[PDB]
Design a protein around this nucleic acid. Structure first.
Lengths: 88, 275
RNA sequence: AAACUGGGAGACUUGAGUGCAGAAGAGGAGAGUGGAAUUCCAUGUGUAGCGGUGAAAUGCGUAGAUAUAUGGAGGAACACCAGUGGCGAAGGCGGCUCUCUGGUCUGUAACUGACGCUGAGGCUCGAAAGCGUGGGGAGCAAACAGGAUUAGAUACCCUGGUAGUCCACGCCGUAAACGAUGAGUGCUAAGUGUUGGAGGGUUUCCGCCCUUCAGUGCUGCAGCAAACGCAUUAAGCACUCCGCC
RNA sequence: CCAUGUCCAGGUUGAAGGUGCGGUAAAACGCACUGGAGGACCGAACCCACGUACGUUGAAAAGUGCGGGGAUGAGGUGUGG
RNA sequence: CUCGUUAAGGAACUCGGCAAAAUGACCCCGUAACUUCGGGAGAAGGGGUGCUGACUUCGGUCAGCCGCAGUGAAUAGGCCCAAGCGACUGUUUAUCAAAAACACAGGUCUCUGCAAAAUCGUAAGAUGAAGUAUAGGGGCUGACGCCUGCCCGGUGCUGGA
């Protein structure tokens, strides 16, 4: 839902080298922006059951990528989840 | 919203109350209160002319502007308050000269608006205008019936009327209750519907709370004696041993009509709908 | 002992996702708006029927019906377009405009580097009918009343008619909820339609020929089946995980 | 019924809301601490009058003794109407 | 008449356990069906309690002593299992009836467009109300839960011409 300038704005600060659109940092940060905006839209339109499906699938994708990042490098994982403000 | 109590005593089980969330203060303007008395239903002569009234809580009278006569000077809205004498809420208003006034609070009034009160006023909630200058299909409250006297008609909590059409020197209105009517085109009204409207859903809950409001209890005609009511007497519980149940003074009580048959206003009433 | 399965340190790009450039659509939520018709109302003209059936009757009508002309009021459904067409995980989705929003397809080759598949228990959604609170109510219509038919008719047929069918918010959690065909992945003849793309040629090709992705139908071979039949959209040849007899 | 005053020893319980912790994608939610609602509870003064014995030319033209009910309320009651 | 005690039995008394007797304070342990999830609940049923010394982390616990008996006097719930009526707190026949009667929060029908209907009064004037249909009067029913069938011939009420 975020514009195409917000997206590049936030993938230019979780990159690692240049040209770095992959790298699970980028993907979970952009997914976090999406999930926040969709939560807003749901609070407003709470009987849009057909958009809630997409919300839930984004949440599944993010949790999966987090599991991957943890199982391979705990330092990057901790530093991220501090920087991004989650892990309740 | 409506507040629901938990059933901690038997006198509490199914009671509800108002949240009082549109109210912003609890200290009224001093220069606008006068005393009252609680007549309790008694006359000039000292006699009960209306049964079932008396003895609750003490009240001071707030003066309201039902006329709306100060034109071409804006007024700002400062407070939304509690009135003990009506069921709508009330607004304290600052004119720019520095006159203060109270006003009935319509649905959706925010603290800070600036209301205008003449023929060149706009069509916004709160604004008051002569009926000539209001289009067809605007929801309206607080309606004058004579020029310069004050609004009389649509005044209680959550009520409204609507403009239907114009003609020579009269405007057609559909009032609350559904009656259609004619009103002089030089009278005033204010744009909106009256405010606090959940008021209808309150459940009083116990016999003491309606005693706090100034109501005394009511005995049914049929457990009286034949010298008190037409329904009194008989061995045991009895049916209505009559045709047409009646009041304590005769006068049938289901379906029998009581308005004046030579009313000087039957010229102006189109389409009686509900009484 | 060191091939395989498991563990540890690495490395790779085909699976899976991301970026960049494009495409189609009754996908969903909110708010307004349009015309055709049915009903009722008002007014003019207008004389004895109208309505209904296999035949009749009940019903409405000389307090002027039906018809016919002009004006208002309200509700619900959206003719032609319209198609073995499109979209959605399913239930489902068709007048028009705006706001908010989910998914799919195609090309490319910046990027990450196996991040994948399935999923007991758990959650979410789920036609119609039904239940609760408060609105709305034109047409249709369980229950019910009246007329017929029959041996009888607590039916089928005719005249009426209440809940309901509609909106907001809660509850219910079931259907022949069906392709009576769980999901993922690879492999195995051909012919012919249509929906959305991408390349090459001739080139007004933008209308034609060829190739190639993803949907949706028809015919048909190997193979399978107890027969019916199925057949690159498998019910064929094989591996993984769940449900069930 | 109206106006204006005044009275209710002492003890119990633990509603809404609030603060901190956990449970979440955000939440329903969970647990402590806080808080002090109510024709709430127990019980004197005070207002009542359920049982019984006595009294019945009474101590009294309606009571006494021993037990009973309500006691922040739809409460008691002084003064002027 | 008002008080105190009583062998053995223990409601056999009487219209009826009437009247008496029994329970009674504080601390600890425990506590069922049912339910509107608050309650029921002090449910029921059991244990401790004086004095001296030592330690007392603090609140108490250990050792010892005495009597038939330690809240040694006075003051202070008996409880349980079932059925009818009324939801509940409240009110009532001053002086033979306190209740299943009245009221009540909730339901429903109906009247009333404001100089409202209704009521006091010959009228003036008043209450209703310094209110305005989510408001005010009248009749019935009486928390809450599930529900509330058939009849418009008669009589009232409303509309008609």
């Amino acid at each position: 839902a975020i514009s195409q300038e917000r997206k590049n704005e936030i993938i230019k600060e979780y990159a690692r080298h240049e040209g770095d659109t992959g790298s699970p940092e980028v993907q979970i940060a952009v997914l976090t922006e999406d999930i926040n905006q969709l939560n807003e839209h749901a609070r407003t339109h709470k009987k849009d059951h057909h958009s809630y499906r997409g919300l839930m699938k984004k949440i599944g994708h993010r949790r999966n990528l987090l599991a991957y990042l943890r199982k391979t490098d705990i330092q990057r994982y901790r530093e991220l989840i501090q920087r991004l403000g989650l892990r309740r | 919203a409506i507040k629901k109590y938990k059933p901690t005593t038997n006198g509490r089980r199914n009671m509800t109350s108002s949240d009082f969330a549109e109210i912003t203060t609890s200290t009224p303007e001093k220069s606008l209160l006068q005393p009252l008395k609680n007549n309790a239903g008694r006359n000039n002569n000292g006699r009960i002319t209306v049964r079932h009234q008396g003895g609750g809580h003490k009240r001071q009278y707030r003066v309201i502007d039902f006329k709306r006569n100060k034109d071409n000077v804006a007024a700002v809205v400062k407070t939304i308050e509690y009135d003990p004498n009506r069921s709508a809420n009330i607004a304290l208003v600052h004119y720019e000269d520095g006159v203060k006034a109270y006003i009935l609070a319509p649905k959706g009034l925010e603290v800070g608006m600036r209301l205008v009160s003449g023929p060149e006023a706009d069509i916004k909630v709160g604004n008051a205008l002569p009926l000539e200058n209001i289009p067809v299909g605007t929801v309206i409250h607080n309606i004058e019936m004579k020029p310069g006297k004050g609004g009389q008609l649509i005044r209680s909590a959550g009520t409204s009327a609507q403009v239907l059409g114009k003609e020579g020197k009269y405007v057609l209105i559909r009032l609350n209750s559904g009656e259609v009517r004619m009103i002089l085109a030089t009278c005033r009204a204010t744009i909106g519907s009256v405010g606090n409207e959940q008021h209808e859903l309150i459940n009083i809950g116990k016999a003491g709370r309606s005693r706090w409001m100034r109501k005394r209890p009511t005995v049914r005609g049929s457990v009286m004696n034949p010298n008190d009511h037409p329904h009194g007497g008989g061995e045991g519980k009895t049916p209505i041993g009559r045709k047409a149940p009646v009041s304590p003074w005769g006068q049938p009580a289901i379906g029998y009509k009581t308005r004046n048959k030579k009313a000087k206003s039957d010229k102006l009433i189109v389409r009686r709908r509900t009484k």
